[PDB]
């Protein structure tokens, strides 16, 4: 099941626990690097937020590089498992489709937000290697099941192209989403299928 | 307004001053220096609001002349997704300096606003009435709105793709078979 492929993540050490010491680090230095700015922060500054000893930082980084690395990379991980996960919920191509879009709605609208929006100008380019991997993936389960969807014939365009224009579609929802007031995520993502598929 | 004549060469170099300079710290000499500008324009703020203006008002008549030359519904739809694609590979100054306006100044830009919106909402319209759109009308157009604009972070880069064809591929995933 999905629950049981989200706590495989876990087992790989690739997912951290919110309320364990490296978790702690990760929440706070997420919170700290988006609403003070990376260049800002110090070690010093995110050991004395969490309530820490600055040395036993070295513990868990080593860096602040590569702190920075692992927010992005946790946040990118933890998004893409869970896509997976609402795929394994799916039962038809439609709603394969209606599972990335819903999904990638509440990374926009929310998700992680603070460990989401965080300073890719700051980040170095071996730790930039990485995350333009993860982002790889990710785009790769939204190009598959387009693909399924478009050999099903729910789709006449190009994957590439329609997979860029529901890029603008969804992302451009933060202007508008809220001032709706009724309208929830939900019908929101129902929407969004009803303009990018068929019948 | 005619872009080789005296005025459209001045709301040109005046939209170029306001983009990346800024109305507040643009100046009266670089305005003048770039003075006929004096003899067109009333004050500093009747250009920022003729640079709006004049762009929305030939963004709006190049979708209307379109929309003519359209024979379908389809062709309709196309026309606009066309028209829209241009300007937005081609309106900055607006959305980086809005304040500077007269209230006036803003009336009239949002009106002008509001009638190429009216444009797009009584087309789309038209093609759910005909059975086109599956969706709602509103959100379709929010939808098409944002994939649109952000065709400016990767059309370039795809080189062998004409905005005609880019067109083309809009329609086919907005309208129904």
Same mark, same amino acid.
């Given at each position: 099941?999905?629950?049981?492929?989200?706590?495989?993540?876990?087992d790989?050490?690739?997912?951290?626990?919110?309320?364990?010491?490296?978790?702690?680090?990760?929440?706070?230095?997420?919170?700290?690097?988006?609403?003070?700015g990376?260049?800002?922060?110090?070690?010093?500054?995110?050991?004395?937020?969490?309530?820490?000893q600055?040395?036993?930082?070295?513990?868990?980084?080593?860096?602040?590089?590569?702190?920075?690395?692992?927010?992005?990379?946790?946040?990118?991980?933890?998004?893409?498992?869970?896509?997976?996960?609402?795929?394994?919920?799916?039962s038809?191509?439609?709603?394969? !489709? @209606?599972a =990335?879009?819903?999904?990638?709605? +509440?990374?926009?609208?929310?998700?992680? /937000? #603070? &460990?989401? *929006?965080?300073?890719?100008?700051?980040?170095?380019?071996?730790?930039?290697?990485? !995350? @333009?991997? =993860?982002?790889?993936?990710?785009? +790769?389960?939204?190009?598959?099941?387009? /693909? #399924? &969807?478009? *050999?099903?014939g729910?789709?006449?365009?190009?994957?590439?192209?329609?997979?860029?224009? @529901?890029?603008?579609?969804?992302?451009?929802?933060?202007?508008?989403?809220?001032?709706? /007031?009724?309208?929830?995520?939900?019908e929101?993502?129902?929407?969004?299928?009803?303009?990018?598929?068929?019948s």
């Open positions: 099941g999905p629950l049981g492929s989200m706590r495989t993540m876990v790989s050490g690739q997912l951290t626990d919110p309320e364990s010491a490296r978790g702690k680090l990760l929440q706070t230095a997420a919170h700290l690097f988006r609403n003070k990376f260049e800002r922060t110090t070690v010093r500054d995110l050991a004395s937020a969490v309530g820490i600055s040395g036993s930082i070295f513990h868990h980084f080593k860096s602040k590089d590569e702190i920075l690395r692992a927010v992005m990379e946790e946040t990118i991980h933890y998004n893409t498992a869970m896509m997976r996960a609402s795929l394994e919920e799916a038809t191509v439609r709603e394969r !489709v @209606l =990335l879009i819903r999904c990638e709605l +509440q990374s926009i609208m929310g998700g992680s /937000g #603070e &460990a989401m *929006a965080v300073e890719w100008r700051s980040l170095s380019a071996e730790g930039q290697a990485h !995350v @333009l991997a =993860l982002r790889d993936v990710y785009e +790769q389960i939204w190009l598959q099941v387009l /693909g #399924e &969807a478009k *050999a099903a729910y789709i006449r365009g190009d994957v590439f192209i329609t997979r860029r224009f @529901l890029t603008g579609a969804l992302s451009w929802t933060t202007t508008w989403f809220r001032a709706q /007031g009724s309208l929830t995520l939900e929101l993502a129902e929407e969004a299928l009803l303009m990018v598929l068929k």
